[PDB]
Structure formats: structure tokens, C-alpha cells
């Protein structure tokens, strides 16, 4: 069974791979994140609860006073989204927190309080999230792209041998917490362990250990294994452990128990070590020279003199051994230093280390971090404690704790947010092990090393910043203040928190203007993943490592959708099925494979867990059971692909499309295309302006309904029902009785948007797509938005492309467009611009918008009203007066400062707004618009009341039928008196009064709503300081196609329309239909985007079936043959899913299907399941078009046949918004600059072009001197020369007087401003 709106036009689907997981809600990231940012959490871990519990309670400076947090609430916003956009204020909710202040007593470290007081204090307003995942800041729709920054934890990076002549690798570990100073541990060419706190100057690593109360003996014990040497009265015996003998050569006879195990010279072999192990030898004899260089472990003091014979970390020598022999020491502990297994890195680092005790290390670290000023016993200690072991100033986070524990192979997964001694020591041990040979570095691109912050995380962090600011403020106030019984309202300032949150939500690298010129662009912008912004890598700081597609992108991030150019790869776009793990990592779905059965249960795998398991391919055949038909199947286990067995497989892809984003899953026949051109197509598909009549994708990808529905534009019925009233401005839906709540009698009123400007100046417009009295179910499309058609995304128009080189007019990439494309007016686009005029209050006097303007005629003021503001609907061309505004003028006495239409734009003034400051007069047009809004609101309120009151009156009539029956005595009198009749003594006696009181309550609700709307409309709006009022006008230009208007398909083939040929001149096949476009085919082979030719063939087939339907419907034949043909058309292909048997379809529904298909049957071609090249032939042959796909075109002008039959088919073409009249502009005598006399900025400011540093070499290379001389002397710079040549040219004389550039004088003056004297000697 199919949905009704789907039943209007069911899209043929070629996908042979069944769907197991429907494409989830495409905006899960933003909505889920901001929902976690605001929520009443019983156990606050995420949301405002987390920040409040982190900062609160607040304690005075031992002032016996404390402020503690209770709860928080979000008051209903004063304004809502529509009026928030129109009026220009942020759509924010005010956060209001209950805070409890308590005062203690004397001699009560923890005793009971003496006084308490709770108060609900308003502190800041947070911009709420619209239903589509977009914030509303200042009348616009900003969005916060999600960030992708290096995950907190421990990263064991290497140098890969670079940055040194020897080509040595210098392994280095880095601890990156979510908030606080970093901590690195890096080696050097000399194999000494060095540290650099906060990427500051370098130091020996051991210093930190000394600062952690660790002696040299403790360091050696921690990082080294003891080797015990004994004195058996001579010969310096030693306790042997066999495994320590590996990698060494026997310098002497290694023997014990009177058995020669190894001899001098021979290297120790694994067989020798095994023989020693079997022999069970613990103690051996070795020469004294073995200790000639070894390092003592712990200090030794003479028993007689109490003097230090030798301290720890000192190489032993023969003299030292002789001295300590008679001292009375028989046991000596050295360090097992080996060149391959246990390197002496700590020993050499300690030798380099100049510090000796904890205090010296702390002084050194203080001088490091805070140089210049003297260190102190307390200052260094406090600094180091507040650096890495302070909850206030250093917090791993927890994603940080989990990564830290997992990387170091620790059992637990949660703990403290601050590092500990064990943590640092374990980090050093692991880095030393990686240096030794055991362990492997962690690449910083494995997507299990990069979180995804969303709007929620960043908003929470900024709110916490504001919270700590207000915490400092209240801390200053409290100890300063006394109890004062001062309510907890004067202590808290709402400016810091509001300022911080608004600053983030309004100004940042991430909170950017939405690219709102499509449904697709909105949905792909909201699901973006940027690697820039605060806390992340900047553009110029990124190499090629992060820019590349690591093998863990599959299923998480899209490989073929990144904006080409300076920032490529840093702006990765999310995949289709990707999600956000609880820690923020990118987890993607997979299917659980049991012993042999592919169970339908879905497991989400993070970037980490994917490596361990074995993952199959999406296109692996199964036989009705989950059993693989092939005993061998492709898999990708550890970042590498390979053929694996049947049972060894663990997981399989949920659906073939999950490798791509949503911006590139809309390209048909993607699997045939190149990667570069797929990127071009998926990057040029989110710029198609919404055409005047968006029509259809004739070859889609089956994934177009989700894009339209899930993005906010398309609108959708909240509750099923039957349409009661359809008008191009509003729709009324009568909810079904089963879907309605018992209390209210609900009818849903959808107020559509009619020609309002979008952020890219394209015109978003919602029209109804449901006729009067037509049923609609839950979640079905009612009002098609911009660039949508019956709920299906329609980015452009599908036209009859014909590949052939025509007379050179498509030489490089240009597209030849038949004039039928513009005559039918299918690429026409409505561009709505906004112009503003602000009347301020100057010191000389306030400005006015009076219609009377000095010195201007009467035709200019004709288009103005009595108030001087242009009419609604007046056709204003360049230069017209739009708002007559005048200002005071010094020694008429006023100056005309009327806003005028910028030259070049020419449109109809569709709407005018007038915002007035609270307590300022209103002009005539302001009164008119106020009255319009007021009457609209009153009419809507009355219409809403009507049916609700009528139902109550009908119920009253029905009640009156029984118990006081009045068949004809009741209808005569007015309904107003129907509520004042008596009743008999029964349960129904208290029913007339109840209904009357309910009616009174309804009228009260109506009147209060009317009053509230009237107040909200009439109130003078708030503006900037010093601005009296603002008058905004909306022009509506209608741009048609012309040479220059860039056009591009979906496979990344672009082009500039090069000529609009007459209808006749274009090629035409024998049937007379002329092809509406003539591409250049030479760009197909080299660019290897061969997807477009298959799309063209499938489009020709689709329209062939459509034209057959149209012919069969032109003559009223029957429904039966229509049924048979449509069934033969939908049953085509093999294995295709979605059995669409029309027996269930009603006859009238079949007729409606035929009506909606006659323009061409839509065809769905999933991204990587695809329509086979053999099925396209079958569908072409279902009509009567040639199977090969190429028909014979007759040249339009000559009239003689083209040789070598040529391709033609219905390709889907967009209209990119790089319109020619936005670009073309030229200047001759525009106004110049002020600092350096030169032309101004381009286009809007009327400036020229940049004869830049690279365009002066282009002339010097020639013998060009005079042209260059003028190009940098009199065209731009010399103040008097340009005027002189102006007069000369007007005088007919072609010459110059070059003089000297004014900018040279500017440079001379600026150099003279310094202490350097510069002049021009002659």
C-alpha cells in the first residue's frame, strides 16, 4: 500500500537491492544536539544542567555566605519564528533560574544556616532552534555547522624521519584535554626524553617527574629493571636471568654449575638461551669489567663514615668498585640498559637534567611558563597545581578520559577529569615502549580520533564561559557585600552570559548564513562537517594528511563531496546513514551476520570497532534466507579489501548508498561517473536557483522525497484528514475524528509563505498541491515548496539534450539553448532584493520621510504616495525615488537624502515594511501596513472561532431537542438566546449552563488573543540607539535566460549558454520535435563523466513511455488498456523491487496517475544499485524509440540529414546562480577613493577592475610602455591628469599629462611619518 501523495505519481524504481534501513531523519545531528543542549536532565551530564552543576554552588571568600543552584526553566518566547524573521529580532527564549542564597553563622564550619532565600532570576536569552534546525539571530536564518576537531586524549605521533639529515624518527606523545594546557613528550636526535608544556620551550622530561615528588632512585625503579650483582668474596658474581642475554655477544665464558654453556666471542643464540632456561641457572660468574660502565641504581652511604660513596644514576668504574668493595657492600643494583629492548633514555635525560630537587624543578617550570618575574616557593607550587591537576583550569572532558584509558590499555572507561601521576607515568612508559619497538603510532586521521561537536556542545561551552564570568562577578560582590538580606537578583548580571551566547550564535567561523537557495542546499548545509573554526586546524595550518580520504571514511563521511578549491577536504560533508555516537564519534550502521544468516538487526559501529570485525559489501547476493549465495565474498577488514570466506564474514552494509553524502546521492548513474566530475556535480548541484515552475527529475535516484520532506521547506500535514479549504495563501485540514484529542475540536491551519526573500536573494514560495476536498494522511506533502514538485525535489528542468558539435557555438563547454527553452519560460527565476532607508535623529534635527523633496520634478514623485514611500506594485526602474527622505542642512535649508533604486535593478515593489521606534510618529504607509496586518489577524481569529462556536451551538440545539423539545420554536429565535432556557431535574440539567459558560470562556479567549495581537502589531519596535525609523522595500526582478547564464547538469558538466537560437535553426528529428539543447560531446570522453550519456538514454526512454501514455490518453480509449500499458511499464526489468500491481489502484486513481505521468514517467536509479545497461534497452524498446539510443537528427538550417546518427535524450539541467547580469559591469568615471585616489570596489560601488601586480608584467613583457604608463598614472592615480584627459577626449584630443601618481605621494608621506627622511633629488 502506497501513500496518497505517492499514489499521485509513483516513481518507477530499478533498485535490485532490498532496503533494510530507511534513510533516517536527514537532520538528526542538529536537532538531537540542540535537544541535548536544552533538556531537564534528572542526572545532569549534558545540557544546561551540566554547566550549572559544574559552576554552582557558589561560595564566598570565607564570608559565611553561599549561593546554590536549584533548577532552571525556559519561558515561552515573546516572539515566534515568522514575526522574529519579519521584525528582525532573535528568536530566543529567556533562561530563568531559581537560585537559593543562604547565610551561615560563626563557629559553624558545617553548621546549620541562619537565613535562606530563594528567587527566580532571569539571566540571558538563548536563540532557540527552529523546527528545521536553523537559528534566527537578526531577521535571518543562521546555522552552526558541526565541527570535527582532534579528539581529546593521548596521541603517539611520529615525525616519520623528517626534519633531520639522518632520517631518524623522533616519536612524540601528546596529551590534548578538552579544556586546558596540553602536554607533550618528544625525543631528539640524541635520544633524550624532552617535554614542552603548552608547546612552549623544551625541557628534559625528568623535570616533571621531579616536580611530582619523585627522586632519581624512584625514577630508575619506575622506568628500569634492576640487575643484581653479588660479591662472593671475589670474582663479582651476578644473578642471571636468561632472557636478558638476548642481543648480546659473550665477551667471556658464560658458565655455571661447572658447565660451559657459552664461550668467549660466540654470540648468544636463542638456542643458548633455551639451554640456559632448561639448565635452571640463576647465579653466574662474570668479570669485573662488566661493571666498568654500568650505572648504579640507588644511593650508597658508607656505614663507617656515613658518607655518600656513590649516588644514583652514576656509571660505575673500577676505582669506584674498589672503593665500595672494602666499604662492606655485597649487593649492587644496576640498570638493564640494552640498545634494542631497554634503552637508557631516562638515564641520559637525567644526566642532561640540571635540576636536583622538587623545588628546583618547580622554579624552573615557573621561569619557563612565567619568565622574567622572580619565582617564589608558593607561586611555582600553585601554578603547577593549577596547570594539570586542577578541576577549575584543566579537564580532560571524558571523551578524553575514555580515549586516554583505551589507548593505554586500561580496564576502566571513566574517572577523574584531571590527570594524575599514574597517568603521566603510563604515558611516558608507552612512549618509551614505542621508541623501543613495541607499539605503533596512532595516525591523526583515523576517524576514531576526531569527534563531532554540534550546536549543542559549542553552545554549552560558551554558556559555561559566560557562567564562569558571572561566577567571578558574584564572587567579587559577595565577600564584598554583607548578608544585607540582598535578594539574589542584584548579585547576578545578565549582561556577560547573554553577551557571550549571542556573540557565539551571531559571530563565529561556524555560525554562518544558511545557503537557502534550495531544499538540497539547506539539507546539505545543516548536515555539514567543518574542520575549521575555534579549537580546530586553520586553512593555512593544514598539510595533506587531513585533506585526504582515510579508509575509515567509508560509511561515515562522504568521499566525493567536498568544496573544491583552497579548502578541500577540510569541509567534509556527512554521509547519508551516519550518526553521532554518545561520545561524538561517527558511527555508521551495519547488519549483524550470525553463523551463516544475515539477521535484519542493525548494529552501529564506531570508527574504532570497524577495524576489528570483518565487513562485507552492500552488493553481495543472498538467497531468501540471509545465506550468501557465493561461498566467497569481498570484505574490508582492517582498512584493506580482500576476498573472504562465507562464514568468516561478520557484518555487511545496510544499503548501497551509505558511502556517499546526501548531496551526491541525488546524481543518477553515479557509479558510472568519474570521481572528479562526481565531485563537480555534487558541488554544483546545491546552487540551482529555484526556477519559476520546478518540474521534475525525469531520471532521479529514488532518494528525492526524503530531501524535500525532511527539509523544512516542503511543509507536511501534521495530522491526517480531509481538505476543507484550499487557497494559495493558506490550507485548512479537518483532522480525522480518530486523530483528534477529546478536549479540542482541532482543525489545522497551515499558513503558507508567498514570495519572501531568501538569504541568497532567490524567492522561496509555497503553493498548494492538494485540491479542495481531497484526503490527506499523516506526514504527506500538502504545499510544494521552492524547487519541489508533488513532494519530489526538482532543482531544475528536464530538457531534450542532443550531443553534437553545432557550428562551433558549443566549442569548449558552451551550451546552445533553443529559444523554445525561454519562450516556454521554464528557466525564468524570481530574484527578490531588499533595499533599506534609515531615518535617524541628527544633532541638527530629526530626519523626515515627507513626500515633498526639494528640487525634484513631479514625475519622480508620481510613484510615491502621500507619505512619500513608493506604492506596492509600482514598476520601478533604475534611479527612481523609493523613499523620500530629507535631512537638515547647514548654511532650501534642507538636503534631499531619499533612497533611490540602484542603477541596473528593475523590478516590482512587492512589499514594504516600516519599523518605528517605541514612542515615534508613524507615517501614512506605516498606518496602512499596520491596518493590513491588524485586519488579517482579526479575520484569522474570527475564522478560527467560527467552527468551534458552531459546534457548541449545534450541541446545544441537540440537547434542546430532548427535555424541552422545540422542533420549530427554537430555530426562529437568534442563537444568542439558545443558552438561557430551563431544563428538567435530570443529569442534563447542569448541561446548558455548562455549555453557556464554556461559550463565554471561548469568547474570552478570542478577545484576549485579539488584544494581544493588536498590541504586538501596534507597538513601536525596538531599534538601534539614535535611529528614528526604518523603511524597507522588496524589489522582485524576474531574470530570464541569456548568453552568460551558467547552466550545468548533475554529473559536474557545466557551461555558459552561448546563444539563444531561433526555433527553426535547431536540429530536429523526422517527427518535427526540435532538440531544446545542443551540448558539446567532446567533453565526455576526456572528462570521463560517462554517467550523463546513460542518464540521457534513460531520459529518452522515460519520455518515450510518457509520450506513449500521452497518445493513448489523447483519444478517450479506455482505462483497461491504460492499466495494461502502465503495468507492463512498471513490471519491466528483472528482480526490481516495489511490486506496484494496479489492481488495488482505483480506476480514478489510475486516471490521475496517467494525468501526472503524461509529461514523462519518472525513473528512479539508486546510486550504487543502479539500472543495468540491459534494462535501459528494454525500457527504450517498450516504447518505439531505437534501442541503441541514438536517433537521426536533421540539421535545422541546411535541411539535409546529419550523417552518423546522434544521441538525444531528456537530461535534467539546473540553472546555477552565477547569472551574467550579476557579473557584467563597467566603469568610466565612477567616484574615487579618499586615502589613495583610486577607483572603488567592484559592481555595486561602480568600481573598475584590478590592474594588479600580475597584470603589469603582462605589459612589461611586451614593448608596452605608454599603455602601462597610463594604466598606472592617469587612469587611476594622478589627481589632475585624469580630468585633463577627460577634457581632452571630450575636446577630441588624444594625449595625456602624466604627472606623478598620488599614491606615490601617499607612500612618501607615510614613510616620512616614520623616523626615515625620504625626498626626490633632481
Amino acid at each position: 500500500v502506497y501513500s496518497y501523495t505517492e499514489k499521485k505519481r509513483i516513481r518507477k524504481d530499478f533498485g535490485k537491492r532490498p532496503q533494510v534501513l530507511d534513510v533516517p531523519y536527514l537532520l538528526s545531528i542538529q536537532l538531537d544536539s540542540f535537544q541535548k543542549f536544552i533538556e531537564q536532565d534528572p542526572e545532569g551530564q549534558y545540557g544546561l544542567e551540566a554547566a550549572f552543576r559544574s559552576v554552582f554552588p557558589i561560595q564566598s571568600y570565607s564570608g559565611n555566605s553561599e549561593l546554590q543552584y536549584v533548577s532552571y526553566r525556559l519561558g515561552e518566547p515573546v516572539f515566534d519564528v515568522q514575526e522574529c524573521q519579519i521584525r528582525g529580532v532573535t528568536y530566543s527564549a529567556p533562561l530563568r533560574v531559581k537560585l537559593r542564597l543562604v547565610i551561615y553563622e560563626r563557629e559553624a564550619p558545617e553548621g546549620t544556616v541562619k537565613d535562606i532565600k530563594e528567587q527566580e532570576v532571569y539571566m540571558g536569552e538563548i536563540p532557540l532552534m527552529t523546527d528545521n534546525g536553523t537559528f534566527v539571530i537578526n531577521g535571518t536564518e543562521r546555522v552552526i555547522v558541526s565541527q570535527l576537531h582532534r579528539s581529546p586524549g593521548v596521541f603517539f605521533d611520529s615525525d616519520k624521519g623528517k626534519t633531520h639529515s639522518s632520517g631518524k624518527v623522533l616519536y612524540n606523545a601528546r596529551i590534548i584535554p578538552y579544556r586546558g594546557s596540553w602536554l607533550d613528550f618528544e625525543f631528539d636526535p640524541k635520544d633524550n626524553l624532552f617535554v614542552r608544556i603548552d608547546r612552549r620551550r623544551k625541557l628534559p622530561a625528568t623535570i616533571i617527574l621531579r616536580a611530582l615528588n619523585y627522586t632519581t632512585e624512584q625514577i630508575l625503579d619506575l622506568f628500569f629493571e634492576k640487575v643484581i650483582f653479588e660479591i662472593r668474596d671475589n670474582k663479582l658474581q651476578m644473578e642471571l636471568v636468561p632472557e636478558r642475554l638476548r642481543g648480546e655477544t659473550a665477551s667471556f665464558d658464560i658458565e655455571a654449575n661447572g658447565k660451559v654453556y657459552v664461550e668467549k666471542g660466540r654470540r648468544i643464540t636463542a638456542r643458548h638461551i633455551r639451554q640456559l632456561e632448561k639448565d635452571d641457572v640463576k647465579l653466574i660468574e662474570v668479570p669485573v669489567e662488566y661493571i666498568a660502565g654500568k650505572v648504579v641504581a640507588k644511593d650508597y652511604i658508607d656505614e663507617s663514615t656515613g658518607e655518600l660513596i656513590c649516588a644514583a644514576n652514576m656509571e660505575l668504574s673500577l676505582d669506584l668498585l674498589a672503593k665500595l668493595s672494602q666499604s662492606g657492600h655485597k649487593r649492587i643494583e644496576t640498570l638493564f640498559t640494552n640498545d634494542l629492548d631497554h634503552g637508557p633514555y631516562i638515564s641520559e635525560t637525567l644526566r642532561v637534567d640540571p635540576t636536583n630537587d622538587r623545588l628546583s624543578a618547580l622554579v624552573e617550570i615557573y621561569r619557563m611558563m612565567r619568565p622574567g618575574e622572580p619565582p617564589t616557593r608558593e607561586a611555582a607550587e600553585s601554578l603547577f597545581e593549577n596547570l594539570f591537576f586542577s578541576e577549575d583550569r584543566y579537564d580532560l572532558s571524558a571523551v578524553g578520559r575514555m580515549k586516554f584509558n583505551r589507548s593505554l590499555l586500561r580496564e576502566e572507561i571513566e574517572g577523574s577529569g584531571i590527570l594524575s601521576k599514574d597517568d603521566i607515568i603510563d604515558v611516558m612508559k608507552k612512549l618509551i615502549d614505542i621508541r623501543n619497538g613495541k607499539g605503533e603510532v596512532d595516525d591523526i586521521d583515523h576517524l576514531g580520533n576526531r569527534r563531532i561537536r554540534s550546536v549543542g556542545e559549542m553552545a554549552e561551552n560558551q554558556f559555561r564561559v559566560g557562567l564562569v564570568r558571572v561566577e567571578r562577578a558574584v564572587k567579587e560582590r559577595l565577600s564584598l557585600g554583607d548578608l544585607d538580606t540582598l535578594m539574589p537578583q542584584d548579585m547576578i548580571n545578565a549582561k556577560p552570559i547573554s553577551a557571550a551566547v549571542k556573540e557565539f550564535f551571531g559571530s563565529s567561523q561556524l555560525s554562518q548564513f544558511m545557503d537557502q537557495n534550495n531544499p538540497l542546499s539547506e539539507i546539505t548545509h545543516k548536515r555539514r562537517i567543518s574542520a575549521l573554526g575555534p579549537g580546530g586546524l586553520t586553512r593555512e595550518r593544514a598539510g595533506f594528511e587531513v585533506r585526504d580520504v582515510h579508509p575509515t571514511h567509508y560509511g561515515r563521511v562522504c568521499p566525493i563531496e567536498t568544496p573544491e578549491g583552497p579548502n578541500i577536504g577540510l569541509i567534509n560533508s556527512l554521509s547519508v546513514y551516519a550518526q553521532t555516537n554518545e561520545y561524538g564519534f561517527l558511527e555508521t550502521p551495519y547488519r549483524k551476520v550470525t553463523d551463516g544468516v544475515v539477521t535484519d538487526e542493525i548494529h552501529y559501529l564506531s570508527a574504532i570497532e570497524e577495524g576489528n570485525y570483518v565487513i562485507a559489501q552492500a552488493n553481495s547476493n543472498l538467497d531468501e534466507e540471509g545465506h550468501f549465495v557465493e561461498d566467497l565474498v569481498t570484505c574490508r577488514s582492517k582498512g584493506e579489501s580482500s576476498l573472504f570466506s562465507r562464514d568468516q564474514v561478520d557484518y555487511m552494509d545496510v544499503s548501497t548508498q551509505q558511502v556517499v553524502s546526501v548531496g551526491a546521492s541525488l546524481i543518477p548513474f553515479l557509479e558510472h561517473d568519474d570521481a572528479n566530475r562526481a565531485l563537480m556535480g555534487a558541488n554544483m548541484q546545491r546552487q540551482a536557483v529555484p526556477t519559476l515552475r520546478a518540474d521534475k527529475p525525469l531520471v532521479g535516484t529514488g532518494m528525492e522525497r526524503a530531501v524535500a520532506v525532511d527539509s523544512g521547506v516542503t511543509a507536511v500535514a501534521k495530522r491526517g484528514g480531509v481538505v476543507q479549504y484550499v487557497d494559495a495563501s493558506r490550507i485548512v485540514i479537518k483532522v480525522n475524528e480518530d486523530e483528534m484529542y477529546p478536549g479540542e475540536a482541532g482543525i489545522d491551519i497551515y499558513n503558507l509563505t508567498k514570495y519572501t526573500r531568501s538569504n541568497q536573494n532567490t524567492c522561496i514560495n509555497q503553493m498548494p498541491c492538494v485540491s479542495l476536498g481531497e484526503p490527506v494522511e499523516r506526514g504527506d506533502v500538502l504545499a510544494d515548496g521552492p524547487s519541489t514538485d508533488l513532494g519530489e525535489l526538482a532543482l531544475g528542468q528536464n530538457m531534450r539534450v542532443a550531443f553534437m558539435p553545432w557550428n562551433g557555438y558549443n566549442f569548449e563547454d558552451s551550451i546552445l539553448v533553443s529559444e523554445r527553452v525561454v519562450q516556454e519560460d521554464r528557466f525564468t527565476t524570481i530574484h527578490i532584493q531588499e533595499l533599506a532607508c534609515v531615518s535617524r535623529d541628527t544633532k541638527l534635527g530629526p530626519e523626515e520621510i515627507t513626500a515633498d523633496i526639494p528640487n525634484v520634478g513631479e514625475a519622480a514623485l508620481s510613484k510615491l504616495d502621500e507619505s512619500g514611500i513608493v506604492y506596492i506594485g509600482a514598476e520601478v526602474t533604475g534611479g527612481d525615488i523609493l523613499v523620500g527622505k530629507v535631512t537638515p542642512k547647514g548654511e532650501s535649508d534642507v538636503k534631499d537624502s531619499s533612497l533611490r533604486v540602484p542603477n541596473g535593478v528593475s523590478g516590482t515593489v512587492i512589499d514594504v515594511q516600516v519599523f518605528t521606534r517605541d514612542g515615534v510618529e508613524k507615517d501614512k504607509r506605516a498606518l496602512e501596513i499596520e491596518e493590513m496586518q491588524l485586519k488579517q489577524a482579526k479575520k484569522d481569529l474570527s475564522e478560527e472561532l467560527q467552527i468551534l462556536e458552531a459546534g457548541l451551538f449545534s450541541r446545544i440545539r441537540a440537547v434542546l431537542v430532548a427535555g424541552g423539545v422545540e422542533a420549530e420554536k427554537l430555530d426562529k429565535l437568534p442563537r444568542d438566546r439558545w443558552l438561557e432556557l430551563g431544563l428538567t431535574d435530570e443529569e442534563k440539567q447542569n448541561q446548558l449552563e455548562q455549555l453557556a459558560e464554556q461559550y463565554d470562556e471561548l469568547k474570552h479567549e478570542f478577545e484576549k488573543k485579539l488584544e494581544a495581537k493588536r498590541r504586538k502589531i501596534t507597538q513601536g519596535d525596538d531599534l538601534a540607539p539614535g535611529v528614528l525609523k526604518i523603511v524597507k522595500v522588496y524589489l522582485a526582478v524576474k531574470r530570464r535566460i541569456q548568453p552568460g547564464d551558467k547552466m550545468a547538469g548533475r554529473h559536474g558538466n557545466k557551461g555558459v549558454i552561448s546563444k539563444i537560437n531561433p526555433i527553426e535553426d535547431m536540429p530536429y528529428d523526422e517527427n518535427g520535435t526540435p532538440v531544446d539543447i545542443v551540448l558539446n560531446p567532446l567533453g565526455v570522453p576526456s572528462r570521463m563523466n560517462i554517467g550523463q550519456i546513460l542518464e540521457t538514454h534513460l531520459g529518452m526512454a522515460a519520455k518515450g513511455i510518457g509520450d506513449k501514455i500521452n497518445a493513448m490518453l489523447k483519444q478517450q480509449q479506455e482505462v483497461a488498456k491504460l492499466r495494461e500499458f502502465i503495468q507492463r511499464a512498471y513490471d519491466l526489468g528483472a528482480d526490481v523491487r516495489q511490486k506496484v500491481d494496479l489492481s488495488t489502484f482505483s480506476d480514478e486513481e489510475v486516471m490521475r496517475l496517467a494525468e501526472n505521468l503524461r509529461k514523462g514517467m519518472p525513473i528512479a536509479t539508486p546510486v550504487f544499485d543502479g539500472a543495468k545497461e540491459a534494462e535501459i534497452k528494454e525500457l527504450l524498446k517498450l516504447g518505439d524509440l531505437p534501442t541503441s539510443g541514438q536517433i537521426r537528427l536533421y540539421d535545422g538550417r541546411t535541411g539535409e540529414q546529419f550523417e552518423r546518427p546522434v544521441t538525444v535524450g531528456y537530461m535534467y539541467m539546473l540553472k546555477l546562480n552565477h547569472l551574467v547580469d550579476d557579473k557584467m559591469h563597467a566603469r568610466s568615471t565612477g567616484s574615487y577613493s579618499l586615502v589613495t585616489q583610486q577607483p572603488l570596489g567592484g559592481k555595486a560601488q561602480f568600481g573598475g577592475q584590478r590592474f594588479g601586480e600580475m597584470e603589469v608584467w603582462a605589459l612589461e613583457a611586451y614593448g608596452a610602455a605608454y599603455t602601462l604608463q597610463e594604466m598606472l598614472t592617469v587612469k587611476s592615480d594622478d589627481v589632475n591628469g585624469r580630468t585633463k584627459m577627460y577634457k581632452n577626449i571630450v575636446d577630441g584630443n588624444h594625449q595625456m599629462e602624466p604627472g606623478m601618481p598620488e599614491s606615490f605621494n601617499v607612500l612618501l608621506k607615510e614613510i616620512r611619518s616614520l623616523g626615515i627622511n625620504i625626498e626626490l633629488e633632481d
Binding site: 610602455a1265 602601462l1268 604608463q1269 602624466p1298 604627472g1299 606615490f1304 633629488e1321
Partner: protein, 48 residues
């Protein structure tokens, strides 16, 4: 630019506007293209 200008100032250096760049900055003719002859004339009139 700081280094070059500081060195020129301390050294008291003296530029004579002979190359393809200083002439370009000052706006005078170029000593390479059509202006070549002019520059030669400017040299011939000088010291004559």
C-alpha cells in the same frame, strides 16, 4: 620591507630609478618598451 627600508635609511642609500620596477612605482615611462628611446634621450640630454 622593514629590513630593506631600515638598511637603506642607515646606509643613506640612493636609488636612481633605472629598473623596470622603480619607474613603474613612480609612474614614469618604462625603460623597456616604447619608452626605451625616451629614457635614452633622458640620458643624452643629461650631462650635455
Amino acid at each position: 620591507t622593514t629590513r630593506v627600508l631600515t638598511e637603506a635609511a642607515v646606509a643613506g642609500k640612493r636609488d636612481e630609478l633605472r629598473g623596470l620596477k622603480e619607474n613603474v612605482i613612480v609612474g614614469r615611462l618604462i625603460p623597456a618598451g616604447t619608452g626605451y628611446a625616451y629614457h635614452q634621450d633622458r640620458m643624452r640630454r643629461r650631462a650635455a
